[PDB]
Amino acid sequence: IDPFEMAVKQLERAAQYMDISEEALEWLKKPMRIVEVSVPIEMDDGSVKVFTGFRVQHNWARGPTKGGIRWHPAETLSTVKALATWMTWKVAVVDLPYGGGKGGIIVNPKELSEREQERLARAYIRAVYDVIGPWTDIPAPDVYTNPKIMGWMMDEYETIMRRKGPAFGVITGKPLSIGGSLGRGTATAQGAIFTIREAAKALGIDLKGKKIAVQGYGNAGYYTAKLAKEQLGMTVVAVSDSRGGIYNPDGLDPDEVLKWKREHGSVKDFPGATNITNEELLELEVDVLAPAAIEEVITEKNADNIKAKIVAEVANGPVTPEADDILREKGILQIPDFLCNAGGVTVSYFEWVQNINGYYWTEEEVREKLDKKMTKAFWEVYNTHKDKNIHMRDAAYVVAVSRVYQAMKDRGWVKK
Ligand SMILES: NC(=O)C1=CN([C@@H]2O[C@H](COP(=O)(O)OP(=O)(O)OC[C@H]3O[C@@H](n4cnc5c(N)ncnc54)[C@H](OP(=O)(O)O)[C@@H]3O)[C@@H](O)[C@H]2O)C=CC1
């Protein structure tokens, strides 16, 4: 299924639940600027290889576009366009002064050395300099890209820009030594925890003493479990990895589970815990479920057999639309995927603000501002959900598209 076709279909579906003009929908169905460039680098053997780079800016009505850069051998312009379109709604739902953007290079980084990767980053910056900037387009880490490459890109941009402004703010996800930000490691989990707390508040459920099951124990899953147990006081009873999952009604200690995973290569066979399958974890009777793993783990087949009161879509779309309808019919509140894991984008914006202002905050200030942002966004989505009598995800889409629509109307881009 073509990614851009899917994104356009999603946008039309969202527009079907709100009052939006045809001209605005047509404007939103097409990225405002797409830049495809050749990225030449010098190989370690002395040869020269040319790579294909992309930089799609879907919309900038609300402000400078924001989005990451992906280094995947299967990158396509369609995928970049779809991800920029999704990033637009991602930044619009949580009320950031950002638009939608995305980049990508068709390259396999597993076969490149450190020098070649640095050359690739610098050449990409040299190619796309004319369409990026602190107030035009702010790239970010993505798949097979890390803060190392962010530092290289920032250094190249500063070299080209002759230090005429906040070159630190041109890109986010940088190392702390050069314009970096605190709380970037646990941003997604912190946002998910705040959204879960607000959902419990909305449902009238006290989380102190309740049970939570987390699917996927990577950076997001482990930190979600850890932060839930620490702040929310929720008993973690089940975690899982690719290999399998474990269960214990008496509770799990996330630090010990992480230690065992980093020692035995997997979370399975944890002492005092019963081994369960991922499917079996989705079956447990808990009050919070946090899929932080592979996409499409909840389908029409197992949607009915879910007993969780709150499903926090920490991952990127772990629930299918049929499963969405079935789960909504069962009186279960869903937190949409691009609202639950909004911490990442929310944190990036804080980093950009720190770079622009020249003043960096502390871990507590970032945590409090993120708390405010996520609470406001979830509350703005839940109110739409209750007023329009539509699905949770649909409420978030309505909020984001309404925000973009209003910004477009204010600029005079669309007269209707
Ligand atoms: N973490 C972040 O900063 C943000 C995360 N996201 C989204 O969040 C999710 C996780 O992020 P991230 O922590 O970076 O991912 P990680 O790569 O750090 O970890 C992936 C985890 O999910 C597990 N996993 C991978 N495939 C499966 C599978 N088929 N079945 C069951 N478990 C699987 C991995 O298991 P194993 O360890 O055994 O390999 C691991 O536990 C993703 O869906 C991602 O798209 C996007 C926004 C930013």
As a whole number of angstroms, the longest Cα–Cα distance in the chain is: 65
Q: Which of 95, 23, 104, 36 is nearest to 62 (CA)?
A: 95
Among 157, 178, 199, the domain boundary falls at: 178
Q: DSSP assignment of 256-310, as one string?
A: HHHHHHHHHSSSTT-TT-EEE-HHHHHTS--SEEEE-SSS--B-TTTSTT---SE
Amino acid at 355: N
283 with 405, same domain?
Answer: yes
Helices of type H across 19-146: 22-28, 77-93, 114-128
Query: What is the crossing angle of helices 392-411 and 77-93, to 10°?
Result: 90
Give the resolution value in Å: 2.6
Helical residues (DSSP H) of 38-113, grouped into ranges: 77-93
Per the annotation, the verdict on 229 as an active-site residue is: no
For the chain, what is the domain count?
2
State whether 254 and 331 are in the same domain.
Answer: yes
Give dist(CA 334, CA 282) in Å, integer.
Answer: 15
In a 10 Å sphere around its CB, with 0-12 CB exposed, 13-18 middle and 19+ buried, how is residue 122 labelled?
Answer: buried
Whether 184 and 322 map to the same domain: the answer is yes
Q: Determine the Cα–Cα distance for residues 117 and 105; give it in Å rounded to an integer.
A: 11
Domain shared by 201 and 349, yes or no: yes
Identity of the amino acid at 283 = E
**Which ligand 1 atom minimizes the distance to the CA of 318?**
43
Same-domain status, 168 and 237: no
Mark whether 66 and 183 lie in a shared domain. Answer: no
For residue 301, what are its two tokens?
Answer: 């087949």
In a domain, 323, yes or no: yes
Question: Which two tokens mark 151?
Answer: 């530092």
> 129, 152, 178 — which closes off a domain?
178
CA distance 391 to 329: 10
Q: Is 165 in the same domain as 291?
A: no
- CATH number at 362 reads 3.40.50.720
Name the residue type at position 260: W
254 belongs to a structural domain: yes
User: Does 184 reside within a domain?
Assistant: yes
**209 shares a domain with 78:** no
Residue 338: CB within 6 Å of ligand 1? no
- Does 220 belong to an annotated binding site? yes
Domain membership of residue 107 as a residue range: 33-178
| Residue 242: strand, helix, or coil | coil
Nearest protein Cα to ligand 1, atom 15:
218
Tokens of 55: 């930089």
Q: Which residues contact 73 (CB under 8 A, 6 or more apart)?
A: 106, 107, 108
The Cα 102–Cα 87 span in angstroms is 8
Pocket test for ligand 1, best of 188, 243, 267 (most atoms within 8 A of CB): 188
Residue 17 lies in a domain: no
Terminal C-alpha separation, the chain: 33
Boundary of a domain, candidates 178, 211, 229? 178
Our answer on whether the CB atom of 342 is closer than 6 Å to any ligand 1 atom is no
Answer yes or no: do 381 and 266 share one domain.
yes
Is 317 marked as a binding-site residue? no
Asked if 237 and 314 sit in the same domain, the reply is: yes
Domain co-membership, 174 together with 184: no
Q: Which of 66, 102, 210, 226 is catalytic?
A: 102
Residue 8 located in a structural domain: no
Whose structure tokens read 């597993």? 110
Residue 3 domain-assigned (yes or no) = no
Strand pairing partners for 265?
A: none
- Asked whether 273 lines ligand 1 (CB < 6 A), one says no
| Cβ–Cβ < 8 Å for 136, 106 | no
Q: Domain of 122: which CATH number?
A: 3.40.50.10860
CA–CA dist 344, 172 (Å, integer): 11
Tokens representing residue 346 in the block: 């929310």
In the PDB record, what is the listed experimental method? cryo-EM
365 alpha-carbon distance from chain centroid: 21
In a domain, 4, yes or no: no
User: Is 258 a member of any domain?
Assistant: yes
Pocket flag, ligand 1, residue 315 (CB < 6 Å): yes
On whether both 142 and 226 belong to a single domain, the answer is no
